[PDB]
Design a protein around this nucleic acid. Structure first.
Length: 265
DNA sequence: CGTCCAGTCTAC
DNA sequence: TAGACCTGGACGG
């Protein structure tokens, strides 16, 4: 999951939990190495917001809910397989690692953080990860300034295709968006990041870092397959017939058309 | 049956 | 840099 999936997941939680009341404890699977969430309330509401490749749940007790409880924030990173589902309480998916349980009246549900591969993480705190840059979807202008004000960073010595995965400057961009972004501008993936960005300061690379992921958000879906067909059809480069692929320095596969670029293996 | 493939995090 | 962290689906023999 990349910024668009985190964004659609936070919309899911807000739409699906809009008229729900949760109650009780926050149950973690016994196999999860993430922290126990110390929260009980007889009546709480769940909402969400996304920032880049992180999502923030707010647990909000209703007026008069017992025990006495302030709102609690949890920040999630999804790794390669995280997601949220709203399921019937006795029909938990495998790998439902964190669960919030509706109170009565009405059918007993569970909102679950589901993560097959368990690369996902959550922290108690509610703070965004120190060091992640602004959200390419929701903080475009801040995101653009943060890159252009710091081209001196050794990060921008690297190929543009690698620079685009560095969550300090491109919070929300991952492996499919870097391929799709670079292909719209026919920028060789192994051009030096500083060269492509100095030449900045007809949409440019930093505008596409916002508008490309925004296109995925507007497709909708992705558990949030018919909806996965829509995505597959949108892709112009990532995994597509007739496209070249190389490994970057960290063993991640960059898809592209044409010139590999000067800094290539 | 097996191999290979799909975002951090941290020990060298 | 390299390996670690995980599960499961696509494929090859």
């Amino acid at each position: 999951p990349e910024g668009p999936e985190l964004h659609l997941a936070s919309q899911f939680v807000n739409e699906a939990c809009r008229a729900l009341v949760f109650g009780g404890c926050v149950e973690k699977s016994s196999v999860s190495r993430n922290p126990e969430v110390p929260f009980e309330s007889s009546a709480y509401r769940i909402s969400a917001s996304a920032r880049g490749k992180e999502l923030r749940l707010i647990l909000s007790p209703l007026p008069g809910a017992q025990p006495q409880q302030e709102p609690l924030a949890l920040v999630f990173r999804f790794g390669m397989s995280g997601s949220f589902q709203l399921v019937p309480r006795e029909e938990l998916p495998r790998h439902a690692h964190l669960r919030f349980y509706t109170a009565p009246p009405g059918p007993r549900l569970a909102l679950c953080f589901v993560d097959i591969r368990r690369f996902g993480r959550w922290d108690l705190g509610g703070k965004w990860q120190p060091g992640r840059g602004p959200c390419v979807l929701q903080e475009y202008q801040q995101f653009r300034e943060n890159v252009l004000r710091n081209l001196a960073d050794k990060a921008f010595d690297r190929p543009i295709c690698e620079a685009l995965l560095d969550q300090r400057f491109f919070n929300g961009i991952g492996n499919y968006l870097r391929a799709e972004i670079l292909y719209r501008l026919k920028i060789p993936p192994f051009e030096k990041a500083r060269s492509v960005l100095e030449a900045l300061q007809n949409p440019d690379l930093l505008e596409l870092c916002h508008s490309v992921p925004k296109e995925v958000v507007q497709l909708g879906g992705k558990g949030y397959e018919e909806d996965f067909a829509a995505f597959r059809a949108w892709l112009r480069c990532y995994g597509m017939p007739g496209m070249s692929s190389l490994q970057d320095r960290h063993g991640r596969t960059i898809w592209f058309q044409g010139d590999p670029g000067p800094l290539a293996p």
